[PDB]
């Protein structure tokens, strides 16, 4: 949880 | 949302969108909602008041667009809805704003937690951020008190946190306020939530991990001069959810 992925 | 930042469900990976269905085949956008677990969504409960029925509602997780398909997206049954034996609200307030929804698959099983498919941090207890703390809100709300469409693309916008001494205050809204309820803004009337947008994430990351600080749930007007937006804060719920989220 909190885990926010990245697509940046 | 009143905000100014179009985002994606990669932005915001727990928010789950939920929809109302019709006898005539379509459905209409009731609130927000967060994953906590694989089958158990938590919104408000000023949402399904007027048609409290958990089996005419379908529930979507991984979709960023309102009314269109997002691939890679998991439609739900809400296979219990129960809310909070304590809601009531008056002339302007609502208290104890928040349900649980426990969803399953049309095929027989819970959410399978992926890139978008995400869940949320709850909040340790008596644990909240000071008064100045920015947190980030989202949802299709309505770009505007007087306007009517709900944005076709998920929103995002920053907000400042405030304190007890400073909504309960004459010119806010005075022993409205309670101490189940966090009140936040910007400045002044540049940003804000609104309707549409209840039953969604108060978002503030503490020690690390981003957690559920708050839920959307009332303030007079979207976005006005000394009138901030208040969230339920979960804060004092931790004990209500996980006694149902176990047995009953
Ligand atoms: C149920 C939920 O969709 C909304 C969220 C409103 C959030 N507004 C702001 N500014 N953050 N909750 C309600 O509509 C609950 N009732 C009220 O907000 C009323 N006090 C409305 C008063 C008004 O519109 O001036």
Redesign the pocket.
């Given at each position: 949880c909190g885990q926010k992925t990245l697509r940046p | 949302i009143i905000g100014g930042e179009f985002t994606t469900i990669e932005n915001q990976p727990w928010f789950a969108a939920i929809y109302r269905r019709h006898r005539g085949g379509s459905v209409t956008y009731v609130?927000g909602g967060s994953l906590m677990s694989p089958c158990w969504v938590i919104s408000?409960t000023?949402?399904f008041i007027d048609y409290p029925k958990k089996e005419d509602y379908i529930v979507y997780l991984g979709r960023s667009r309102l009314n269109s398909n997002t691939q890679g997206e998991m439609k739900f049954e809400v296979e219990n809805l129960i809310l909070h034996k304590d809601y009531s609200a008056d002339t302007?307030?609502?208290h104890n704003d928040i349900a649980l929804l426990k969803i399953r698959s049309k095929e027989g099983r819970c959410a399978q937690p992926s890139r978008t498919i995400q869940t949320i941090c709850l909040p340790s207890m008596y644990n909240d951020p000071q008064f100045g703390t920015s947190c980030e809100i989202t949802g299709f709300g309505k770009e505007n008190?007087t306007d009517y469409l709900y944005p076709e693309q998920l929103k995002m916008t920053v907000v400042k946190l405030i304190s007890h001494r400073e909504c309960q205050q004459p010119h806010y809204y005075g022993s409205e306020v309670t101490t189940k309820m966090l009140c936040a803004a910007d400045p002044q009337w540049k940003t804000?939530?609104?309707?549409?947008?209840?039953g969604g994430p108060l978002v503030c990351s503490l020690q690390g991990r981003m957690t559920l600080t708050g839920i959307?749930?009332?303030?007079?007007?979207?976005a006005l001069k000394d009138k901030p937006?208040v969230y339920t804060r979960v804060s004092h719920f931790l004990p209500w959810i996980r006694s149902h989220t176990k047995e009953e």
């Open positions: - | 609130c408000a000023h949402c302007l307030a609502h008190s804000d939530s609104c309707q549409g947008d209840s959307v749930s009332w303030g007079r007007g979207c937006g």
